[PDB]
PDB file of C-alpha atoms in Angstrom:
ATOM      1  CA  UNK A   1     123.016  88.076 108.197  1.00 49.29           C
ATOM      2  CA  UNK A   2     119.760  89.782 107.193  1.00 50.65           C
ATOM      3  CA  UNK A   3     120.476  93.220 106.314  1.00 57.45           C
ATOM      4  CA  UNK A   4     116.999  94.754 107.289  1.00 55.95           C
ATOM      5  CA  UNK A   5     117.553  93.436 110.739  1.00 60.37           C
ATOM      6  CA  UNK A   6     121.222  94.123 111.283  1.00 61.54           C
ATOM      7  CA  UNK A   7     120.391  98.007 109.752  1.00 62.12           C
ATOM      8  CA  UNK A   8     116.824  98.373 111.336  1.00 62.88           C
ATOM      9  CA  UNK A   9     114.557  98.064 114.607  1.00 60.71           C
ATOM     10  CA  UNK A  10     110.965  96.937 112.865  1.00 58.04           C
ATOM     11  CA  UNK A  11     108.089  99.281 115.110  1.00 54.17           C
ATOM     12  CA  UNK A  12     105.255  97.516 113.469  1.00 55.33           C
ATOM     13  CA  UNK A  13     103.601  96.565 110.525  1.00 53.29           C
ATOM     14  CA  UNK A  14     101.490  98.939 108.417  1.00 49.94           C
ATOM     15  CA  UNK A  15     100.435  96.370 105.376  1.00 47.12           C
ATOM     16  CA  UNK A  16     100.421  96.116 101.699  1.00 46.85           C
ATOM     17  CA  UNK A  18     101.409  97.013  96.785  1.00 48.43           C
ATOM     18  CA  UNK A  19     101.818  93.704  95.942  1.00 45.48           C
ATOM     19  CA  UNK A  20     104.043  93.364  99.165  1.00 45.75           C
ATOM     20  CA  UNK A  21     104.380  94.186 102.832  1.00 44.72           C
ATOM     21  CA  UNK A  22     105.170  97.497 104.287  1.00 43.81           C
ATOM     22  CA  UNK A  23     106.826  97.994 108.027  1.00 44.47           C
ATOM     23  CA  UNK A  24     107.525 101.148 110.558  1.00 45.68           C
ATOM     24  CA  UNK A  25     110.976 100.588 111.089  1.00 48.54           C
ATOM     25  CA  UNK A  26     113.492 102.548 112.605  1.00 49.31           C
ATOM     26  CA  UNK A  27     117.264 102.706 111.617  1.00 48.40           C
ATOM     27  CA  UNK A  28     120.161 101.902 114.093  1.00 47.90           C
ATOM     28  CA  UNK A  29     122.563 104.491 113.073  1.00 46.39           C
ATOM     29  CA  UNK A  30     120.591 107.795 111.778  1.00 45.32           C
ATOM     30  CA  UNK A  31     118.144 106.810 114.319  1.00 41.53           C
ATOM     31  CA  UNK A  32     114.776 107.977 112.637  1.00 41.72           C
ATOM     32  CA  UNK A  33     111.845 106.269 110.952  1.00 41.70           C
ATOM     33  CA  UNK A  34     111.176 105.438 107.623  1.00 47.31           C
ATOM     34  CA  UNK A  35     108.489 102.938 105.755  1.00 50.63           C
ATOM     35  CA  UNK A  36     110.087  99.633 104.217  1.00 53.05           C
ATOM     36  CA  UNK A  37     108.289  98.017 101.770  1.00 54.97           C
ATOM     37  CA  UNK A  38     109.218  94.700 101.425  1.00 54.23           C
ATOM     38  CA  UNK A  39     108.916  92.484  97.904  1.00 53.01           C
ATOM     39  CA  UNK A  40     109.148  89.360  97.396  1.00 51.82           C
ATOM     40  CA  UNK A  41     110.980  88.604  93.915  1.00 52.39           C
ATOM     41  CA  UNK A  42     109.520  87.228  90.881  1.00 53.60           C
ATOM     42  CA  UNK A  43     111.846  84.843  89.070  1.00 57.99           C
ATOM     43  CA  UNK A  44     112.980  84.687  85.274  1.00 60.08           C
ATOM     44  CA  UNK A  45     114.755  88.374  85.099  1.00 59.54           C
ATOM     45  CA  UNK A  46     112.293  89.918  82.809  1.00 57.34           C
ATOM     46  CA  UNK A  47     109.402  90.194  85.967  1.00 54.20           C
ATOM     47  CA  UNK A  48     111.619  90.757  87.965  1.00 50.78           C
ATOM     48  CA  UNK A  49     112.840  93.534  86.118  1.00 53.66           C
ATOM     49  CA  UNK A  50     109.762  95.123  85.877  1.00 55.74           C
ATOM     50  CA  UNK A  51     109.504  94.989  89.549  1.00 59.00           C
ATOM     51  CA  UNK A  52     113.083  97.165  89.312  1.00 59.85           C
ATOM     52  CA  UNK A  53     111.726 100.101  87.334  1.00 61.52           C
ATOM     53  CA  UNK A  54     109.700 100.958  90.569  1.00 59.09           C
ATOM     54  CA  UNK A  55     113.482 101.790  91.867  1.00 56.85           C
ATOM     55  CA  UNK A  56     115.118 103.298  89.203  1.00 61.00           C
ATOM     56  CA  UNK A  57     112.082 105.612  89.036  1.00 60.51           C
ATOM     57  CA  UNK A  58     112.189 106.450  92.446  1.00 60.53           C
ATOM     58  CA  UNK A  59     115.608 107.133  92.629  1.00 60.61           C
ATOM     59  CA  UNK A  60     115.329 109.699  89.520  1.00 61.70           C
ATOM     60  CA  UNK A  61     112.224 111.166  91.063  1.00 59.80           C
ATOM     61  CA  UNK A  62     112.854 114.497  92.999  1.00 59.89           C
ATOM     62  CA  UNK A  63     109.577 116.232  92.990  1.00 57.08           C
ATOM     63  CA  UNK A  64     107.652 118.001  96.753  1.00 55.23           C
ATOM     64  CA  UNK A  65     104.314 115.635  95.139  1.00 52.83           C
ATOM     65  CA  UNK A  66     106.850 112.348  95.043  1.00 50.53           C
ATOM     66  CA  UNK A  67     107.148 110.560  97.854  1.00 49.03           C
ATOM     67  CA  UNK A  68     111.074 110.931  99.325  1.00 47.99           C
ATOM     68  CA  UNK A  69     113.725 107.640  98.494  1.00 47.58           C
ATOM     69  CA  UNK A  70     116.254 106.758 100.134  1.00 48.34           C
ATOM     70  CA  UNK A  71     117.795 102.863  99.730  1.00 47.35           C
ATOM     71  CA  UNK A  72     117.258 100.066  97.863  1.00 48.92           C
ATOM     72  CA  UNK A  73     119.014  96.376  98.451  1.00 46.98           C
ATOM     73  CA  UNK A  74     118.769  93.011  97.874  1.00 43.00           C
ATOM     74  CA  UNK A  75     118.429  89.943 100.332  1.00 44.01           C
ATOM     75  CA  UNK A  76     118.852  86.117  99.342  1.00 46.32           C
ATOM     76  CA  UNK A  77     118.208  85.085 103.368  1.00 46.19           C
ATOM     77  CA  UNK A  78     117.437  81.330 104.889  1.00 45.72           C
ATOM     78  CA  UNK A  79     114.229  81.358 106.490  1.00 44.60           C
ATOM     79  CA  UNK A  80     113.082  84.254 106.897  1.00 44.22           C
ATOM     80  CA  UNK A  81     109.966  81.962 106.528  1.00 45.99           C
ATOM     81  CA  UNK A  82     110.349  81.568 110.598  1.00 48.46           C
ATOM     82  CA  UNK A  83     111.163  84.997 111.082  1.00 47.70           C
ATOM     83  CA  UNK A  84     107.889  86.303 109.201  1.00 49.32           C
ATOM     84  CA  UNK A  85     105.123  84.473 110.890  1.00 49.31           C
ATOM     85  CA  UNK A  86     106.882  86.303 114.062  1.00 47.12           C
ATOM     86  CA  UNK A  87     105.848  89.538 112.733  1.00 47.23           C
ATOM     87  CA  UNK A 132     115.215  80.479  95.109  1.00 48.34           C
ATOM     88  CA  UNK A 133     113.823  83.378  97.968  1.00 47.81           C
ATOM     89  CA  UNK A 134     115.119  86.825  96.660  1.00 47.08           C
ATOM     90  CA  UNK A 135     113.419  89.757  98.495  1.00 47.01           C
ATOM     91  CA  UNK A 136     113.406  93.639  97.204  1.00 46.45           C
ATOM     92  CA  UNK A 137     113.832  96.215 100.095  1.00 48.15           C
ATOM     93  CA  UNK A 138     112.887  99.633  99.230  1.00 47.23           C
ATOM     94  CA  UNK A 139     113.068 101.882 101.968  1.00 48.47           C
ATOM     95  CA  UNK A 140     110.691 105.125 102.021  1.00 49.87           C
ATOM     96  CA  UNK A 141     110.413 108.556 104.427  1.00 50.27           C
ATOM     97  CA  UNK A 142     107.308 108.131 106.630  1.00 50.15           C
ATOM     98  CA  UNK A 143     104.175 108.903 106.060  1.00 50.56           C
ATOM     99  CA  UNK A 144     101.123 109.525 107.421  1.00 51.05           C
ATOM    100  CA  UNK A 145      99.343 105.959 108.487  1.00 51.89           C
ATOM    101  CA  UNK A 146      96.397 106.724 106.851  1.00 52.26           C
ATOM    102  CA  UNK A 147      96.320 107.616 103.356  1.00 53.18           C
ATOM    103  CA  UNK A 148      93.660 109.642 100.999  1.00 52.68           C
ATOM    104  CA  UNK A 149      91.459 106.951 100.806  1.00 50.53           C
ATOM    105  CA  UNK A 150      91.109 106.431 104.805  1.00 51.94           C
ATOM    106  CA  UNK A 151      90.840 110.180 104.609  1.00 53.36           C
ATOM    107  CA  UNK A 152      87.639 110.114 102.726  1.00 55.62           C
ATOM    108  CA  UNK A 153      86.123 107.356 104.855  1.00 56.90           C
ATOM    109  CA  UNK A 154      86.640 109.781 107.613  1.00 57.97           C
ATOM    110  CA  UNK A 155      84.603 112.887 105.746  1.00 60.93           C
ATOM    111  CA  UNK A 156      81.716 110.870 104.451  1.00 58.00           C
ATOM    112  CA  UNK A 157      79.323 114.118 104.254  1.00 56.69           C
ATOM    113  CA  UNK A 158      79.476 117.246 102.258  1.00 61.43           C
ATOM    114  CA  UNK A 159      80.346 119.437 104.860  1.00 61.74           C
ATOM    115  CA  UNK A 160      83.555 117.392 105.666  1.00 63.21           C
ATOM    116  CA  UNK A 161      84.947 118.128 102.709  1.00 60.81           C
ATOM    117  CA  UNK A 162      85.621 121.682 102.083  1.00 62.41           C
ATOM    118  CA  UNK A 163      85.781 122.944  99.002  1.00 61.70           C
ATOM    119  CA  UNK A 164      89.468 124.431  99.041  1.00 63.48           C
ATOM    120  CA  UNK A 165      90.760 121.887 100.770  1.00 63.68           C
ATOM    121  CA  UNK A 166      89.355 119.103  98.102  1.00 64.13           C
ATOM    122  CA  UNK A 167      91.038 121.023  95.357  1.00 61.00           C
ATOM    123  CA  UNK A 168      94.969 121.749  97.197  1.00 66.65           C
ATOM    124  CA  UNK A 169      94.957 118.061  97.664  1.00 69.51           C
ATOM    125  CA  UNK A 170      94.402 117.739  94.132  1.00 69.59           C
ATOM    126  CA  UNK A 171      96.260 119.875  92.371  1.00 68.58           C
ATOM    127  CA  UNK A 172      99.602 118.634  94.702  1.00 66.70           C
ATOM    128  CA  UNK A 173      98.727 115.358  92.801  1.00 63.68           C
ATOM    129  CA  UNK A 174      97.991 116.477  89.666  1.00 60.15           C
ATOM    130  CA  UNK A 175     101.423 119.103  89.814  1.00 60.90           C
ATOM    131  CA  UNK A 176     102.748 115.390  90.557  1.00 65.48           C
ATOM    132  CA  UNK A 177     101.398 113.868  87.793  1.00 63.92           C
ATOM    133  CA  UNK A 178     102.235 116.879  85.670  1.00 62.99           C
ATOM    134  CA  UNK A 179     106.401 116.048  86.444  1.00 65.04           C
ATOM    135  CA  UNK A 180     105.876 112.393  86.320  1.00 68.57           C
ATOM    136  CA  UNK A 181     104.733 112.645  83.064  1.00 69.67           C
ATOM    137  CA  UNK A 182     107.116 115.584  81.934  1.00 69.62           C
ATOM    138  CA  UNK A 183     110.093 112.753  82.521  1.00 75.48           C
ATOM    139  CA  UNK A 184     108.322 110.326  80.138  1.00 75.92           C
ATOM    140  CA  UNK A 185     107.270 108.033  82.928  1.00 77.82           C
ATOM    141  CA  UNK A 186     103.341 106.629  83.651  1.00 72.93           C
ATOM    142  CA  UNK A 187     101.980 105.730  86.807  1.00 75.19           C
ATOM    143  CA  UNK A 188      99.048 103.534  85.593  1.00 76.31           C
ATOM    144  CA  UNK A 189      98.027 102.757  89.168  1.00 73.22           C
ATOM    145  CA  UNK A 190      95.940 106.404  90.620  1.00 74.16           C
ATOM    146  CA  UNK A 191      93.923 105.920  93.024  1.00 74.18           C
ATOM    147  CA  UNK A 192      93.392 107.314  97.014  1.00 71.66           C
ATOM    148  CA  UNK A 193      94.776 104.498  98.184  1.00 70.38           C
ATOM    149  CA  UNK A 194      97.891 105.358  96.357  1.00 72.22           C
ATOM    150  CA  UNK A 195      98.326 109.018  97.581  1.00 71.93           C
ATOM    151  CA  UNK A 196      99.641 109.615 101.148  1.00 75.10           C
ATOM    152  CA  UNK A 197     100.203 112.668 103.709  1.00 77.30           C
ATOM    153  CA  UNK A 198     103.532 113.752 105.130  1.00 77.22           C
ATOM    154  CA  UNK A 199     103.848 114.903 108.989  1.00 76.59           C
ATOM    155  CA  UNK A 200     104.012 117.947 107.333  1.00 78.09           C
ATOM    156  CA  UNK A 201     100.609 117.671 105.534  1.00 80.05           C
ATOM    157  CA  UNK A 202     102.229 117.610 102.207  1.00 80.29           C
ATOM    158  CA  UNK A 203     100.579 115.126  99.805  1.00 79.86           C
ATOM    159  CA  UNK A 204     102.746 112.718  98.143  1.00 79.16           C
ATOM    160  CA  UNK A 205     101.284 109.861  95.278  1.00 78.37           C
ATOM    161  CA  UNK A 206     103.260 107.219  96.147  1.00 79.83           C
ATOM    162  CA  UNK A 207     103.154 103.944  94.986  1.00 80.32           C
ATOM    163  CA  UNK A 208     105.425 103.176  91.871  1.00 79.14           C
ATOM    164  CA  UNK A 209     104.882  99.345  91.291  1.00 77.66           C
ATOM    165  CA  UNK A 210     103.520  99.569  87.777  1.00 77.47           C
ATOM    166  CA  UNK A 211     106.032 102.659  86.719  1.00 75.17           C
ATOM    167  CA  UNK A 212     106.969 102.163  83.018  1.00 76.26           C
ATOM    168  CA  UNK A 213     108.144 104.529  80.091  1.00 75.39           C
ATOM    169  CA  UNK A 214     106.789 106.348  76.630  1.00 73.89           C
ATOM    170  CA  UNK A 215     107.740 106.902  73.743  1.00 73.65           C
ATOM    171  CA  UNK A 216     106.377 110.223  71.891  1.00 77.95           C
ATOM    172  CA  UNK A 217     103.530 110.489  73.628  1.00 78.21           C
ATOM    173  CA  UNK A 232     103.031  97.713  72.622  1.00 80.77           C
ATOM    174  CA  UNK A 233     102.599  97.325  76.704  1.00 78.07           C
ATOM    175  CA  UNK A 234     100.695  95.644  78.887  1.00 77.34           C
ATOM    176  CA  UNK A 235      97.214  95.265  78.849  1.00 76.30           C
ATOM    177  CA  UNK A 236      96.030  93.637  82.601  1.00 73.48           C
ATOM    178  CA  UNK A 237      97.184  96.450  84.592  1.00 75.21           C
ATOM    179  CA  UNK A 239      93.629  98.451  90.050  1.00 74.81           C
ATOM    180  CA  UNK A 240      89.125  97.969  89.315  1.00 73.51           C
ATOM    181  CA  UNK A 241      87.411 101.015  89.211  1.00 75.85           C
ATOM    182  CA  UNK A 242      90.407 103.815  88.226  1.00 75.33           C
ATOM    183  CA  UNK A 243      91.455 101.899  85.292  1.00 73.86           C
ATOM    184  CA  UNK A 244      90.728 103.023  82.051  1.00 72.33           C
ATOM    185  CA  UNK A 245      88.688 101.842  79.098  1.00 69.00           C
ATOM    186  CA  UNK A 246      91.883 101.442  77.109  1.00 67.62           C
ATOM    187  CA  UNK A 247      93.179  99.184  79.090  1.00 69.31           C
ATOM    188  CA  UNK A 248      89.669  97.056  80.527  1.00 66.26           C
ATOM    189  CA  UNK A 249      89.097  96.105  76.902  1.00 61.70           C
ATOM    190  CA  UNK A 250      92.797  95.395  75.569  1.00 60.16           C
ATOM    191  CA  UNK A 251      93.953  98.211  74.275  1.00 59.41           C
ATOM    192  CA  UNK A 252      97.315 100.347  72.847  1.00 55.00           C
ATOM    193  CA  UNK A 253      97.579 103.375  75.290  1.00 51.52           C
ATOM    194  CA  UNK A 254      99.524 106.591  77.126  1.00 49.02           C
ATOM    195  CA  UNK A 255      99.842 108.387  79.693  1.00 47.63           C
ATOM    196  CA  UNK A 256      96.134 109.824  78.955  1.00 44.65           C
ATOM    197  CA  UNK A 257      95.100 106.680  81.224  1.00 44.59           C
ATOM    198  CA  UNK A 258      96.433 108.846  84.171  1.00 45.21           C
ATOM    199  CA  UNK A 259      94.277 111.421  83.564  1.00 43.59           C
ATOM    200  CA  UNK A 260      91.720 109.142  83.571  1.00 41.94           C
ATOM    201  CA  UNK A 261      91.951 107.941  86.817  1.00 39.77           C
ATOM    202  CA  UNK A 262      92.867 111.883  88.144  1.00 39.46           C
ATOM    203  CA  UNK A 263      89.397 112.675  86.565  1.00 39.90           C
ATOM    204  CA  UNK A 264      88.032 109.779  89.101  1.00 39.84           C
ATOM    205  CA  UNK A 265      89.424 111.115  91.745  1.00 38.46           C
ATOM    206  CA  UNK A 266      88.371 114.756  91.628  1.00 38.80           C
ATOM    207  CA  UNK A 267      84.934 113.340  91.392  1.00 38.49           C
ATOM    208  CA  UNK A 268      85.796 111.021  94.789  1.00 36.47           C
ATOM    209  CA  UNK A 269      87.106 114.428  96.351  1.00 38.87           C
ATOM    210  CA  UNK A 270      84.047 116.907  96.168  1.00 36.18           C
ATOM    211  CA  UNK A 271      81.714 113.912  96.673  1.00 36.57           C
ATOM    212  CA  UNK A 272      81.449 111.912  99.429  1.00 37.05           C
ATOM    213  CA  UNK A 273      80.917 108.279  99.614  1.00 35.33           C
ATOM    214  CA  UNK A 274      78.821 106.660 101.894  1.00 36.85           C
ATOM    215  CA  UNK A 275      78.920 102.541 101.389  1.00 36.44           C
ATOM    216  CA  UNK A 276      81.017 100.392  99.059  1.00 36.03           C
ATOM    217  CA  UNK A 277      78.068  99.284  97.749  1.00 33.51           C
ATOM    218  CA  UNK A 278      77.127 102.938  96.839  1.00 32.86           C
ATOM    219  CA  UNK A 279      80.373 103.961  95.991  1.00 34.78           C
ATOM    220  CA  UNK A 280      80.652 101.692  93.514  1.00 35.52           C
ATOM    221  CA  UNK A 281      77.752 102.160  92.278  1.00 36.14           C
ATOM    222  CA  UNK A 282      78.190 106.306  91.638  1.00 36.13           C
ATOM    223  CA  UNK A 283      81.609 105.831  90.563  1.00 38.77           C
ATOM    224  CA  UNK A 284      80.850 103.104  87.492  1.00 40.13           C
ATOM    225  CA  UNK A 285      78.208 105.806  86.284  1.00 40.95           C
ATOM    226  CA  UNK A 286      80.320 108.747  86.554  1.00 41.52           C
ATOM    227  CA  UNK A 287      83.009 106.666  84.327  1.00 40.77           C
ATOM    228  CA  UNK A 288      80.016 106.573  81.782  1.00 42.98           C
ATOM    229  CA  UNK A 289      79.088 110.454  82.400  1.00 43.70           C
ATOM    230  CA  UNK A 290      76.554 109.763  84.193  1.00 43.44           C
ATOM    231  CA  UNK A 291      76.649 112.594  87.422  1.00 43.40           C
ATOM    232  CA  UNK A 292      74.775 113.052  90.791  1.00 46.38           C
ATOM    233  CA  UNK A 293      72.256 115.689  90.572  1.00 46.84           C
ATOM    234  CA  UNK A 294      74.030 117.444  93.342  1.00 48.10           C
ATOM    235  CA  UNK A 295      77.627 117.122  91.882  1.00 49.95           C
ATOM    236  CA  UNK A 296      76.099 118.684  88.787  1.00 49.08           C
ATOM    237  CA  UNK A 297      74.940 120.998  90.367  1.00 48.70           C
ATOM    238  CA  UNK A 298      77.282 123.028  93.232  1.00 47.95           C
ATOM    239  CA  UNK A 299      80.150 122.010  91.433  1.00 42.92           C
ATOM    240  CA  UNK A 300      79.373 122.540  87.577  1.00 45.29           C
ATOM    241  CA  UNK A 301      83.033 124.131  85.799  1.00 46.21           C
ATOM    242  CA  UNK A 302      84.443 121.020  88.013  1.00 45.45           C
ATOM    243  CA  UNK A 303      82.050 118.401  85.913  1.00 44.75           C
ATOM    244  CA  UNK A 304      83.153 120.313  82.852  1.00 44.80           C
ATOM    245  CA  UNK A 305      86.597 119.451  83.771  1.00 44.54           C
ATOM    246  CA  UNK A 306      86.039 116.035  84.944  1.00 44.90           C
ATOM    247  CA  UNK A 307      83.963 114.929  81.701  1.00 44.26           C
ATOM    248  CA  UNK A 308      86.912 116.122  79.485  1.00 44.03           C
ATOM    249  CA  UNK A 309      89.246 114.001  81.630  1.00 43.84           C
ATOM    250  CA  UNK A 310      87.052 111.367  81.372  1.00 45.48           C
ATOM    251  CA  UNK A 311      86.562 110.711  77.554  1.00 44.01           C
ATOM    252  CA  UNK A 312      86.577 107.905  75.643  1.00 41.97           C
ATOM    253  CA  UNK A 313      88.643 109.152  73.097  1.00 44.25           C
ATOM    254  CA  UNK A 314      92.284 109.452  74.781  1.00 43.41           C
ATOM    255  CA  UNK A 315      93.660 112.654  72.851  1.00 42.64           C
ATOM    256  CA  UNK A 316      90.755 114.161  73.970  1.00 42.03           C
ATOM    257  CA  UNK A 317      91.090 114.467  77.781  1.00 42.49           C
ATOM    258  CA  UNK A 318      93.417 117.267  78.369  1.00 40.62           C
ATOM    259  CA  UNK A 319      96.884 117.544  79.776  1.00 37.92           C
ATOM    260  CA  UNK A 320      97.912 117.137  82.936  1.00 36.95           C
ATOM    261  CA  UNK A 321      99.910 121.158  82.771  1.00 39.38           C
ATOM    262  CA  UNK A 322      96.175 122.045  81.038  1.00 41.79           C
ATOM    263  CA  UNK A 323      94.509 120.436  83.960  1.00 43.39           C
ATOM    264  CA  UNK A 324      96.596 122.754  86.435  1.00 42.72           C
ATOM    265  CA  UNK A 325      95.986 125.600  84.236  1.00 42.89           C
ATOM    266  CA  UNK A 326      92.559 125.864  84.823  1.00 42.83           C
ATOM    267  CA  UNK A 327      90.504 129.077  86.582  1.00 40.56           C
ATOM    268  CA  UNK A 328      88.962 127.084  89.204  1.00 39.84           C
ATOM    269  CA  UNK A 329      92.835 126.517  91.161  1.00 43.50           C
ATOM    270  CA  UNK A 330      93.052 129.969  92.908  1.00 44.66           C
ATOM    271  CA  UNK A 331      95.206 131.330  95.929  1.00 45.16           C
ATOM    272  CA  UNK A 332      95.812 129.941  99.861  1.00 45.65           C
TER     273      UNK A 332
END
């Protein structure tokens, strides 16, 4: 008997990382929380790697950190049937719920300046970078930051939340295919490299915060540029000890790009 179904009452879908996410509501505690369903890789060494996503989690207690609270295992026959409803080894990891739509459908929302206040942009980052901060103070990398990866409690609280490519440090070889436009140039061209890559992609980000996108096309567009330094005349502008922080972040040279507790540190974070 399938465990997710015998524990939970699926609400709906909500959809993908690699795998599928539901709404579903548990039986006995009776409130709801997000499962994200995986569906194993075989060999023990992938699959593995697919594990330190949990065993991150579950060490993870952090207001920025999105909340744990199970993980199992199901081996089930045909579940094949019982999917297109809604040798086979399946990873449930069940999640509190979020918000359904996450920074990135939050942008798309505020796609003009005056959208996106300027306090506003900044408390949303510094939650993730005070995230990053801890995540990084336990020797752990998230090498996947992007909007799309950073949620909203009912509560308003942002939470970064997506752990699939979670691995360790040391001191601070591994894996060089690693997300498009967030990843960094360590990484793109084959590369040894740390937990500066996060920073990286946090510089990104900021950028994405305090200016809004339009298109794809032009988003794309902006955002390969601003990985080379090269910034809007109007982010230059309004928003210059901001570019002096983001440029840093954004470096080449991995040692150079600050901190993530230096990154907090900074004047421009203020008061409520």
């Amino acid at each position: 008997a399938s465990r997710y179904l015998t524990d939970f009452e699926p609400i709906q879908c909500m959809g993908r990382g690699f795998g599928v996410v539901f709404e579903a509501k548990n039986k006995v505690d009776d409130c709801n929380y997000a499962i994200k369903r995986i569906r194993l890789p075989n060999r023990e060494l992938a699959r593995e790697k697919v594990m330190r996503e949990v065993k991150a989690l579950a060490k993870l207690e952090h207001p920025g950190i999105v909340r744990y609270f199970n993980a199992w295992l199901e081996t089930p026959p045909e579940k094949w049937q019982e999917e297109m409803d809604e040798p086979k080894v399946y990873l449930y990891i069940q999640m509190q719920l979020c918000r359904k739509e996450n920074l990135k459908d939050w942008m798309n929302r505020r796609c003009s300046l005056e959208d996106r206040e300027h306090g506003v942009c900044l408390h949303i980052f510094i939650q993730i970078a005070e995230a990053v901060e801890f995540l990084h103070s336990k020797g752990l990398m998230h090498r996947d930051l992007k909007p799309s990866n950073i949620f909203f409690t009912m509560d308003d609280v942002v939470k970064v939340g997506d752990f699939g490519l979670v691995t360790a440090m040391d001191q601070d070889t591994h894996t060089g295919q690693v997300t498009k436009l967030y990843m960094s140039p360590e990484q793109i061209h084959g590369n040894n490299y740390s937990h500066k890559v996060d920073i990286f992609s946090l510089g990104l980000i900021l950028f994405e915060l305090l200016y809004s996108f339009s298109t794809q096309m032009e988003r794309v567009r902006i955002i390969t540029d601003v990985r080379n330094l090269k910034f809007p005349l109007l982010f230059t502008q309004k928003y210059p000890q901001e570019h002096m922080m983001v440029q840093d972040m954004l470096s080449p040279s991995p040692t150079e790009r600050p901190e993530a507790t230096d990154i907090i540190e900074n004047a421009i974070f203020e008061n409520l």
